[PDB]
Scaffold this active site. Structure first.
Site, PDB file in Angstrom:
ATOM      1  N   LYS A   1       0.409   4.286  -2.151  1.00 31.63           N
ATOM      2  CA  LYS A   1      -0.748   5.165  -2.023  1.00 31.63           C
ATOM      3  C   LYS A   1      -0.330   6.578  -1.613  1.00 31.63           C
ATOM      4  O   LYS A   1      -1.057   7.549  -1.837  1.00 31.63           O
ATOM      5  CB  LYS A   1      -1.778   4.577  -1.058  1.00 31.63           C
ATOM      6  CG  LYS A   1      -2.488   3.358  -1.620  1.00 31.63           C
ATOM      7  CD  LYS A   1      -3.320   2.638  -0.576  1.00 31.63           C
ATOM      8  CE  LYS A   1      -3.647   1.302  -1.144  1.00 31.63           C
ATOM      9  NZ  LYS A   1      -4.033   0.347  -0.098  1.00 31.63           N
TER      10      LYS A   1
ATOM     11  N   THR B   1       2.806   3.554   5.397  1.00 32.93           N
ATOM     12  CA  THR B   1       3.172   2.155   5.559  1.00 32.93           C
ATOM     13  C   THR B   1       2.560   1.361   4.411  1.00 32.93           C
ATOM     14  O   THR B   1       1.731   1.870   3.654  1.00 32.93           O
ATOM     15  CB  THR B   1       2.642   1.611   6.887  1.00 32.93           C
ATOM     16  OG1 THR B   1       1.246   1.880   6.879  1.00 32.93           O
ATOM     17  CG2 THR B   1       3.203   2.340   8.088  1.00 32.93           C
TER      18      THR B   1
ATOM     19  N   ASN C   1      -8.848   1.188  -0.067  1.00 36.53           N
ATOM     20  CA  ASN C   1      -8.657   0.591  -1.384  1.00 36.53           C
ATOM     21  C   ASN C   1      -9.680   1.112  -2.389  1.00 36.53           C
ATOM     22  O   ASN C   1      -9.386   1.192  -3.583  1.00 36.53           O
ATOM     23  CB  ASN C   1      -8.695  -0.929  -1.376  1.00 36.53           C
ATOM     24  CG  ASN C   1      -7.489  -1.528  -0.703  1.00 36.53           C
ATOM     25  OD1 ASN C   1      -6.347  -1.183  -1.026  1.00 36.53           O
ATOM     26  ND2 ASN C   1      -7.729  -2.436   0.232  1.00 36.53           N
TER      27      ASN C   1
ATOM     28  N   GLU D   1      -4.713  -7.151  -5.908  1.00 34.97           N
ATOM     29  CA  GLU D   1      -3.880  -8.204  -6.476  1.00 34.97           C
ATOM     30  C   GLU D   1      -2.389  -7.860  -6.352  1.00 34.97           C
ATOM     31  O   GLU D   1      -1.552  -8.753  -6.398  1.00 34.97           O
ATOM     32  CB  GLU D   1      -4.241  -8.546  -7.924  1.00 34.97           C
ATOM     33  CG  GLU D   1      -5.546  -9.316  -8.108  1.00 34.97           C
ATOM     34  CD  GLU D   1      -6.788  -8.421  -8.105  1.00 34.97           C
ATOM     35  OE1 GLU D   1      -6.643  -7.163  -8.017  1.00 34.97           O
ATOM     36  OE2 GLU D   1      -7.920  -8.975  -8.188  1.00 34.97           O
TER      37      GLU D   1
ATOM     38  N   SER E   1       0.806  -1.210   0.000  1.00 31.66           N
ATOM     39  CA  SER E   1       0.000   0.000   0.000  1.00 31.66           C
ATOM     40  C   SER E   1       0.848   1.272   0.000  1.00 31.66           C
ATOM     41  O   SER E   1       0.312   2.369  -0.133  1.00 31.66           O
ATOM     42  CB  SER E   1      -0.978   0.000   1.121  1.00 31.66           C
ATOM     43  OG  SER E   1      -2.056  -0.867   0.810  1.00 31.66           O
TER      44      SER E   1
END
EC number: 3.5.2.6
Length: 267
Positions: free
Chosen positions: A49, A212, A108, A145, A46
């Protein structure tokens, strides 16, 4: 001396937990750097992001998007781990609130929506990073994924160095103008998922912004941060880890300790 000792320390640490640690740290005050496996590839999870939020702010600044525009998604089937998008599904969110949700809560739905409509998918996201001079970063897949963290797979990876350099460019440099850069900083400082990682490695009174990432496979997890020590120029820290076995769990304390070591190496 100091740099080789720090290497010996990280090496032992990766061996302790049977995996691999990648580090890159910069003192922006002196220019001093420290790197360990800093050119090797690690899964992004992640952590990307935080860059996606910057790509949004860059679009705002270029006047291709408005930070306050309503993004409606009333009909959408939201991904796993959309804490923020799911609560506003009925009414929409501003682009800014959505972009920061992707960052601060690793949402997400926020993430996939932004990439589909504003950013030209994973290739668009990758293109954004090339535009700031980052050649290592690659996003190949969508949430979720991109989390498979399969040993040997180069998809959805970067290098610790590449990540540090980029975060420096975006958070402390000149990609964003004074005003938009401050917003971005506030987003980073507002991250909620980072308390047991880099933030754990520095005094509570220092100001930290981070993103993170945790794949939830192969003990793969990471953190990057801008740190403002009291009365000192900012630091940049970039910690990436994987583990041998599929069923290994990530290790916050290892990340924290890798950060502790890195911060000292550049001191």
């Amino acid at each position: 001396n100091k740099s080789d000792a720090a290497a010996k320390q990280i090496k032992k640490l990766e061996e302790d937990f049977d995996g691999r640690i990648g580090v890159f740290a910069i003192d922006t005050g002196s220019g001093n750097t420290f790197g360990y496996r800093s050119d090797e590839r690690f899964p992004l999870c992640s952590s990307f992001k935080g860059f996606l939020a910057a790509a949004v702010l860059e679009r705002v600044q270029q006047k291709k998007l408005d930070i306050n525009q309503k993004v409606k998604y009333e009909s959408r089937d939201l991904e796993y781990h959309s804490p923020i998008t799911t609560k506003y599904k009925g009414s929409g969110m501003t682009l800014g609130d959505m972009a920061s949700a992707a960052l601060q809560y690793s949402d997400n739905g926020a993430t996939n929506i932004i990439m589909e409509r504003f950013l030209g998918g994973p290739e668009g996201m990758t293109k954004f990073m090339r535009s700031i001079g980052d050649n290592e970063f690659r996003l190949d897949r969508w949430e979720l994924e991109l989390n498979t963290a399969i040993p040997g797979d180069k998809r959805d990876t970067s290098t610790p160095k590449a990540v540090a350099n980029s975060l420096n460019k975006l958070a402390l440099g000149n990609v964003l103008n004074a005003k938009v850069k401050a917003i971005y900083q506030n987003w980073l400082k507002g991250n909620t998922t980072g308390d047991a990682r880099i933030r754990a490695s520095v005094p509570a009174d220092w100001v930290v912004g981070d993103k993170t990432g945790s794949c939830g496979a192969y003990g793969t997890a990471n953190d990057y941060a801008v740190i403002w020590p009291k009365n000192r120029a900012p630091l940049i820290v970039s910690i990436y880890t994987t583990r041998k076995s599929k069923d290994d769990k990530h290790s916050d304390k290892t990340i924290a300790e890798a950060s502790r070591i890195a911060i000292q190496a550049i001191d």
